[PDB]
């Protein structure tokens, strides 16, 4: 049990020795560049999201717009179709009565020539 002990520091409440059994750059700007590069790509992520949310806002505007267009197109086509058939119905009904009363007038004129013919007969 041969062990080269070396009596090192020793004092009142401590001592120490070493027994031997056998012999045998720093850059802060580069730091903050990494921090800032991470912050900037975070902002790139936020911007690309906010752009994505803008297209969905715009899509909600387009959907609501065409809903207004459908309601407006429905109104005016109904308006014009009702006006077209009401006017076409008036001309039809007026033409029927105008024709019926022209034949009635023709009948009247025939009664006057019947009376005319009799009077010329009476001159005999």
């Amino acid at each position: 049990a041969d062990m080269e002990v070396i009596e090192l520091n020793k004092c009142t409440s401590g001592q120490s020795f070493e027994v031997i059994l056998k012999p045998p750059d720093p850059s802060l700007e580069e730091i903050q560049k990494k921090l800032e590069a991470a912050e900037e790509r975070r902002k790139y992520q936020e911007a690309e999201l906010l752009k994505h949310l803008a297209e969905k806002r715009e899509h909600e505007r387009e959907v609501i717009q065409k809903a207004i267009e459908e309601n407006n197109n429905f109104i005016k086509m109904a308006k014009e179709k009702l006006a077209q058939k009401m006017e076409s119905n008036k001309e039809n009904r007026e033409a029927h009565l105008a024709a019926m009363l022209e034949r009635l007038q023709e009948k009247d004129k025939h009664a006057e020539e019947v009376r005319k013919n009799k009077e010329l007969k009476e001159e005999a």
Binding site: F74, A78, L82, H96
Partner: protein
Amino acid sequence: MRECISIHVGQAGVQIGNACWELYCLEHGIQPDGQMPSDKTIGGGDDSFNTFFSETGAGKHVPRAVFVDLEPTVIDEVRTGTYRQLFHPEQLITGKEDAANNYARGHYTIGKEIIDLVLDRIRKLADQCTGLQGFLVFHSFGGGTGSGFTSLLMERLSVDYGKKSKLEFSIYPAPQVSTAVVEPYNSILTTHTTLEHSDCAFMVDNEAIYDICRRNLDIERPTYTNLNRLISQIVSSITASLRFDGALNVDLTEFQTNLVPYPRIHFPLATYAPVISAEKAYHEQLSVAEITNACFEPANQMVKCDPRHGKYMACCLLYRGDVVPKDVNAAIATIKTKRSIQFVDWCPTGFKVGINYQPPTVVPGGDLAKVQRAVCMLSNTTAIAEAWARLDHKFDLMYAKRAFVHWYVGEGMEEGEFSEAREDMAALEKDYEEVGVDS
């Protein structure tokens, strides 16, 4: 908010509006003088009954309704009836000459005389509503006013109110208790023009209602008010979730979304249970199941068509009285097992349910017995293509010989309108057939 304006057109629509508003008044306890001794909020307030009623400064509760007929005798009794003081006189609008069973006269020659006057009173009632839901249009199919004027009104409403919701409650033509031979003409023509303008049309016919009253009330021949007061229960059951605070509601938009699978397929038929005579009134009450099973029995359909002949596309079951959701869900559960009741393969859920706890009431002294529970089913089934085919065949028998067409041509109509209308009815028959085939 969420108000609804009821428009009653023609004799059928006006006398059905008489029965409904009388029943509404009894359900809400509104006296014949217009005063409601159960609404503390004088001259205002936004409780649930106010969807169908407005309030005056004096307390009178006035209906959000317009009664219009090209002829005054039927509306005159409203002006002289027990409920005369319910309406301001401007709400009851009459001409002096009816459409004489002629769609052309209702839609063109006679109807044009009062159409704007009608529309401007619609606008004034709509001016008194903070959030208009839509319109309920009551009319028959067969009369000149019920077909011609209603179609003209529906077209005008679309102009003035856009795509706002318009729902119809229509009486389907029935030979058995018919009144005019030209009913097939008027019905095909009015269906053709109000098709694009109506969001949904609840349908009954007086034959099936007549037979039901005969069979289940022991009446040798039911009178028109017998039919009407039974119809009033159907209508009140449809509007119950909008006039009463309810756990599960069905508003005007909910009817549309759930019952109309395609724009042209918007004709659900009504059904109602139970219908019990007052003399055998108080025996042991019927289940919640039994009245639900009754809605799918072919004998109880308010339109005489056979549901076993077609597939169900959508079923709206509206309960009132002593019924809670667990009872309904169980009753529906076993109906979902019934092999005889078939649904289209493109509607897996297929059901819509509203419930109201207030009990149903009937006019005192009537033939109908008051019950604890009641249900009205509005079924959109392909089986009513039979009803369209029956009407279209009668149309064909007379149009082939052009019988009675001279009455329509004389008032400005062209024969082209007749073939357009019928061709569209042939497309409707084919549409009902096409939506029924499997995927």
